[PDB]
Symmetry: C7
Subunit: 30 residues, 7 copies
């Protein structure tokens, strides 16, 4: 369904956010 | 549908958020 | 519909968040 | 409806988050 | 309804996030 | 219901995020 | 259901976000 697909799109964007936050943690280390 | 379209706009905004967090990581590295 | 409108409000608020995160990146570089 | 009202509460909370992120940007500038 | 109640929990959690982001701004100023 | 339970898991995850942001505010203080 | 499954993906992505924010707090402390 279109609604399920859009919700999966939201999840994908949030996994993208998480990746970026992990990069921030690494940047602060260095 | 209007609900699906709005959910897709939520995902798009979160992709913007992810892009900015990646820029934050870059600013911290540099 | 009221549900669709509310979901669009959520998306707009997240677009505000993204703008603010971009400002944080700009502040860190500057 | 209760669902629409709850979704608007989510948007309002996210607008609060954006406000705080804007404050973080200003704090970093100074 | 259970769905509305859960959405309200989501909004409340985001209000917690906003409070914490405000504390982050305050810590940066101080 | 499965949908309500999933929404409550989203809320719980966001409360975890808030806890982490509170730790960030503390870390900046120290 | 597909909608419930997608909402659970959203929750899991937020749990990834929370882990990363904790790592950010740890990096700032150290």
């Amino acid at each position: 369904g279109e609604i399920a697909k859009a919700l999966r799109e939201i999840a994908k964007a949030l996994r993208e956010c998480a990746w970026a936050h992990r990069e921030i943690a690494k940047a602060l280390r260095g």
